[PDB]
Structures are given as structure tokens and as C-alpha cells.
Amino acid sequence: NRPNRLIVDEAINEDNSVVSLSQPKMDELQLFRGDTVLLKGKKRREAVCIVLSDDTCSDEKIRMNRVVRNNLRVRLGDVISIQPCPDVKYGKRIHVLPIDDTVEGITGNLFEVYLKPYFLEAYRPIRKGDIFLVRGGMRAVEFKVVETDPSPYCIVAPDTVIHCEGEPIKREDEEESLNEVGYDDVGGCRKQLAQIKEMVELPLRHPALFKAIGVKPPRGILLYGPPGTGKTLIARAVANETGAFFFLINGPEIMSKLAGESESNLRKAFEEAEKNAPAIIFIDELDAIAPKREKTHGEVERRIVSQLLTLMDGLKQRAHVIVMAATNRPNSIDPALRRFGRFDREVDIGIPDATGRLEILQIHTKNMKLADDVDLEQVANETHGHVGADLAALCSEAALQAIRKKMDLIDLEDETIDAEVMNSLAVTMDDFRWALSQ
Amino acid sequence: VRGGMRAVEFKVVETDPSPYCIVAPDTVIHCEGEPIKREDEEESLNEVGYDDVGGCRKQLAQIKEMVELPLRHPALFKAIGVKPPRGILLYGPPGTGKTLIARAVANETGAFFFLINGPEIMSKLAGESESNLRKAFEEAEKNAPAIIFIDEL
Ligand SMILES: Nc1ncnc2c1ncn2[C@@H]1O[C@H](COP(=O)(O)OP(=O)(O)O)[C@@H](O)[C@H]1O
Numbered sequence: 101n102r103p104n105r106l107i108v109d110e111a112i113n114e115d116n117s118v119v120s121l122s123q124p125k126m127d128e129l130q131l132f133r134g135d136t137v138l139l140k141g142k143k144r145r146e147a148v149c150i151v152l153s154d155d156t157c158s159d160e161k162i163r164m165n166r167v168v169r170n171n172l173r174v175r176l177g178d179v180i181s182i183q184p185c186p187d188v189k190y191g192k193r194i195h196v197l198p199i200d201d202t203v204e205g206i207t208g209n210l211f212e213v214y215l216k217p218y219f220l221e222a223y224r225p226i227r228k229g230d231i232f233l234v235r236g237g238m239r240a241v242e243f244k245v246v247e248t249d250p251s252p253y254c255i256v257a258p259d260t261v262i263h264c265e266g267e268p269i270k271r272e273d274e275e276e277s278l279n280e281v282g283y284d285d286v287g288g289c290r291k292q293l294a295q296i297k298e299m300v301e302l303p304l305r306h307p308a309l310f311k312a313i314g315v316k317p318p319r320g321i322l323l324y325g326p327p328g329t330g331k332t333l334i335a336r337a338v339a340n341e342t343g344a345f346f347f348l349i350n351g352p353e354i355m356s357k358l359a360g361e362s363e364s365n366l367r368k369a370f371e372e373a374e375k376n377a378p379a380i381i382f383i384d385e386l387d388a389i390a391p392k393r394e395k396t397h398g399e400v401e402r403r404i405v406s407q408l409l410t411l412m413d414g415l416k417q418r419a420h421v422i423v424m425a426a427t428n429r430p431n432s433i434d435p436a437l438r439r440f441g442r443f444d445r446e447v448d449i450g451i452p453d454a455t456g457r458l459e460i461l462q463i464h465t466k467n468m469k470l471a472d473d474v475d476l477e478q479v480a481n482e483t484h485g486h487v488g489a490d491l492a493a494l495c496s497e498a499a500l501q502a503i504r505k506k507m508d509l510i511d512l513e514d515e516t517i518d519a520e521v522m523n524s525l526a527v528t529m530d531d532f533r534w535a536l537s538q
Numbered sequence: 539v540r541g542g543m544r545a546v547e548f549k550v551v552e553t554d555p556s557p558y559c560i561v562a563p564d565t566v567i568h569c570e571g572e573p574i575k576r577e578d579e580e581e582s583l584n585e586v587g588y589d590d591v592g593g594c595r596k597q598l599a600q601i602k603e604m605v606e607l608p609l610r611h612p613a614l615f616k617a618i619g620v621k622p623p624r625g626i627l628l629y630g631p632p633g634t635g636k637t638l639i640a641r642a643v644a645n646e647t648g649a650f651f652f653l654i655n656g657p658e659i660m661s662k663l664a665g666e667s668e669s670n671l672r673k674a675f676e677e678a679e680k681n682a683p684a685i686i687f688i689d690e691l
Pocket residue numbers: 285286287288289325326327328329330331332333334426460463487488489490492
């Protein structure tokens with residue numbers, strides 16, 4: 101019912117110019133190994149990419165990274181149409197500007213540091229209005245294509261002139277920053293994400309379904325695991341990734357308000373999540389609010405839990421809002437929070453495995469220049485019981501250590517850090533060694 | 539100059555062979571009886587320094603590199619995306635020099651310092667106590683780069 105309509109799935113290839121289909125689909129569509137394609141999605145939007153084959157992709161689905169997925173205004177699960185675009189040709193001019201909130205903090209020649217490397221002999225196809233990301237100098241810069249000579253699409257070839265007229269455009273509301281949490285910023289968890297994903301899929305993406313249906317979707321999702329496991333990161337991603345409205349509640353934070361002023365906040369919070377539903381309410385250190393078991397004691401401490409219980413049971417309505425909480429383990433939480441209609445779903449986010457760390461390591465080093473001697477697999481292999489928060493700290497320390505030896509001693513700090521400088525600096529295996537040895 | 543169980547600070551107001559010279563057995567030394575007032579940007583030597591700490595070495599080496607960049611090269615973090623250590627916890631029995639250590643790193647790094655003491659905070663009336671914690675943190679930020687040292691945590 102249109103051989104060219106596919107379900108936007110996740111990417112295997114992190115490159116902004118490629119999208120993957122399955123060979124049988126490439127046949128049915130008569131597409132080849134490197135063909136440039138025209139992709140149509142929502143809000144009457146389009147994108148141009150290179151299509152490769154992917155034996156793990158299904159005939160119906162299409163793999164595409166978050167950059168393209170945004171250029172198209174679609175979320176995972178959504179459907180787009182694909183059409184060949186052989187008529188595309190070498191670009192003449194190209195005007196692009198950086199998105200202001202992605203270059204604050206730096207000064208220098210971005211073109212040299214970012215554009216030049218990014219395009220260089222890659223022949224990336226671009227459509228006007230495209231927004232693309234480029235990583236370097238320990239950060240990522242967002243660029244919008246303001247206009248292309250062969251309009252509205254063309255390939256950026258070694259001859260294509262690239263204008264970058266010095267004024268950073270301001271981001272437009274409906275243009276989510278790529279610097280946002282995504283499923284692509286989570287590693288290790290997979291089965292857990294698979295579960296959570298399907299749990300919120302319908303209620304958060306197809307609300308009307310529940311207006312017309314009589315079945316009950318899961319209402320509360322509880323996340324188990326030690327600190328720095330990515331529970332918050334996971335919840336924030338599912339929200340972003342699903343266009344859902346997000347509202348974070350933090351125990352310590354709530355539990356520091358004066359008696360009564362504390363509950364007024366819980367309610368004001370829930371009350372707001374509903375205003376913007378579909379929404380996800382994430383209670384951070386939950387056990388900081390609901391421990392009741394044997395450890396609860398206080399004509400306020402108890403008055404709060406009860407308040408949370410009430411607020412929980414208060415859910416159930418139109419566009420649904422789901423509640424996600426986090427704690428280290430069952431035992432911590434008030435048994436009352438389990439009572440079905442409340443936190444009736446549970447997900448245990450263990451500690452990554454060897455592969456999981458390798459994955460996590462990659463995610464946290466994507467914006468930095470790693471020397472060829474850097475062996476992340478080794479690093480992954482020796483960090484047995486680490487959790488994401490650990491690995492991230494490990495990367496952060498290896499980079500700061502690198503910054504202290506190199507840049508630091510030459511001394512070009514405390515001023516207005518130059519991109520070219522930060523861009524040249526490379527973290528070495530020696531730098532990770534230093535970090536792993538503290 | 540140290541002596542009489544204390545140290546005296548002296549400023550050279552003028553030298554004959556100006557602006558520099560050697561003080562030899564013949565050099566006359568005037569000391570006209572009026573003590574000048576210290577100038578803001580002239581830190582007293584009677585201040586805590588790494589040179590007033592002994593025993594710790596490896597610990598100071600660590601703490602030093604930990605605060606080096608964030609406290610001496612702030613812009614780095616305005617231009618960078620990495621996270622510097624945020625809280626440094628000091629373990630050890632009483633009278634180990636934890637406070638002295640923290641106060642030195644601050645002075646020694648031109649950092650702004652703000653001391654918070656548990657007993658002190660915990661003696662304010664309910665609510666009046668938290669208002670102080672916030673007012674404290676709030677002030678350390680006004681003068682950042684700064685170091686907030688919570689004493690008896
Ligand atoms: N699975 C993961 N993938 C990538 N980074 C992770 C992961 N788990 C943790 N982290 C890192 O650790 C920090 C962990 O904190 P957070 O997400 O708040 O986790 P938790 O809620 O368990 O403390 C995250 O911001 C992220 O940088």
C-alpha cells in the first residue's frame with residue numbers, strides 16, 4: 101500500500117548523509133548501493149540522502165539518524181516516502197550559518213575547523229533548509245543550509261564554494277537541538293529500552309486510541325539500578341524521542357521545601373504535566389520521598405508519600421501522561437507505590453557488560469579527537485563493574501588531563517578559547533591511562 | 539621578616555640607586571616611623587599557603603590538578619563541553635589540616651573563598667538555617683571562580 105512508504109527506525113550508521121534499507125526493498129524500488137534519494141516526511145518536509153544496504157533492516161523499515169529524522173520532522177515509528185533523485189548535481193555556491201546556541205563559548209574559524217573537514221571529498225547531498233551537525237573541539241556545532249545554488253538540493257563537491265557570512269541564526273522552536281538526549285546517547289541498555297519503548301509507544305504517540313478504546317495502558321514505570329546507570333537519561337530520551345512533554349521532579353529538591361510547601365509542589369508538578377500531555381513525569385530519587393516501609397517517620401514525611409499516592413491514583417485521562425520514577429531497588433520504595441494502578445511496571449537497569457561499556461565509551465568521546473593509539477575496547481575491557489556515570493567521568497578526566505599537558509603548558513587559556521586550538525588537541529591512550537590510574 | 543614570634547611585612551618605598559640595587563654593609567636604611575596601609579591587591583604573607591602545609595603531598599597534588607583548570611581557566615569550560623570535578627570530599631581525623639588545605643588552594647589560586655560550618659548552620663532557627671546555606675552558595679557564585687568549604691559536613 102505504497103512500496104515507497106517506510107517506518108523510520110534507528111540508524112546503524114551515524115553519518116548524516118546516509119539512510120539504510122534492505123536489499124529486497126532496494127530491488128522492489130530499483131535503488132543502488134550509493135544512489136542519492138529524496139525523502140519526504142511531515143510538515144511538508146524533505147531531505148536528500150545516500151542509500152546503503154542493511155541486512156539487519158526489515159523490508160518495511162528505514163534506518164536514519166536523528167539529524168535526518170529532524171530535518172524531516174518525523175519521530176521513530178513514523179512513516180516517510182522514499183523516491184530516487186538521480187537528477188541531482190554538483191553545487192555552485194552554498195550559504196550556511198551556525199545556530200547561535202551551538203557556538204556560544206567558542207571563537208575562531210568554524211569553516212576551517214568544521215565545514216571544511218565535514219564536507220571534504222565526501223560529496224554530501226544537501227537540500228536547502230537542512231540542519232546538520234558537526235563534531236569537534238570537544239563539542240558539536242549545528243549548521244543550517246540557508247540557500248544552495250543549484251536549488252533546492254545539490255551535492256557539495258570539491259569545487260562547491262561555501263559561504264558562511266558571520267551571523268549565527270537563532271533556533272526556531274520546532275527545531276530540536278541535536279545536543280538533546282536521544283536513544284543514541286544511551287548504551288548498554290537495549291532490552292530495557294525495547295520494553296520502555298513499547299510501553300509508552302501508544303499512549304504517548306497515539307492518545308486518541310485511548311479516547312476510543314477501553315483498555316488501560318501502563319501508568320507508572322519504575323526504574324531499578326545503582327546510581328549513574330542512566331535512569332534519568334533514559335527517561336529524558338524516551339520523552340524527547342517521542343515528542344512527549346517532560347517534567348522532572350527530584351526528591352531531595354521536593355523534600356527541602358517547608359512542610360506543606362513541599363506537597364503544593366508535587367501537585368503543581370503533576371498538574372502541569374497534564375496541561376501539556378502527552379507527558380512524562382520523572383520523579384528522580386523517589387525513595388527520597390517514599391520509603392515508608394520501616395524508615396518513614398514524620399507528620400510531614402508521611403503526609404507527603406500519601407500525597408504522592410493520591411496524585412498517582414489521580415491519573416488516567418485524555419492524552420495520557422506516564423509517570424517514571426527511579427530508585428536503587430524495590431526495598432527502598434514504599435510498597436504502596438506498587439499497588440497496581442500506580443507504579444505497576446518495573447525495569448531493572450543493570451550495570452553494562454563489556455560490550456555495553458565499549459558502547460557507552462564511544463558515546464562520550466564522539467565530540468573529542470582521539471589519537472590512533474586510543475584503544476577503547478581495552479578501556480572497556482578493564483572497567484568491569486563501572487556504570488555510565490563512571491565511564492563518562494573517565495572520559496571527562498582523560499580529556500581534562502590531555503588539556504593540562506598540551507594546551508595548558510603552551511598556555512592559551514583564560515581569554516576566549518579558539519576552536520582551532522581545541523580542535524587540534526587529541527586525547528591519547530596515555531591520557532586514558534592516566535585517568536584509569538587515579 | 540620573621541622574629542619575636544611573628545612575621546613583619548615591609549615595603550620598599552624607594553631605593554637610592556633606583557629602581558633596583560643591592561643592600562650592602564654600607565647601604566643606609568631609613569625607616570621613618572609611619573606604617574603604610576595595605577593595598578587590596580597585596581595579599582598578606584600571613585595568609586595560608588601550600589607552604590604552610592606539611593605531610594600531605596600526594597593529596598595536594600591531586601586536589602591541585604583537580605581545581606587547576608576550572609579555577610584558573612574558566613573560559614576553557616565556556617568553550618568546552620567536558621565536566622570538571624564538582625565536589626571534593628576530604629577524609630581524615632580532626633586536626634589533619636583539611637580546612638587549612640582548602641583555604642590554601644583557594645588563596646594559592648586567586649579563588650574566592652567562603653567557609654560554611656555545620657555547627658554554625660545547625661544552630662540557626664528552623665528555616666533560618668537553610669536560608670543561610672542558600673545565601674552562602676548564592677554568594678560563592680557571585681564571586682566565582684570560588685571554593686565553598688563546608689566544615690563539619
Ligand atoms: N547507559 C548509558 N549510556 C550513556 N551514558 C550513560 C549511561 N548511563 C549513565 N550514563 C552517564 O552517566 C550520567 C548518569 O546519570 P543519570 O542519567 O542521571 O543516571 P541515574 O539516574 O542512574 O543517576 C548520565 O548523564 C550519562 O552521562
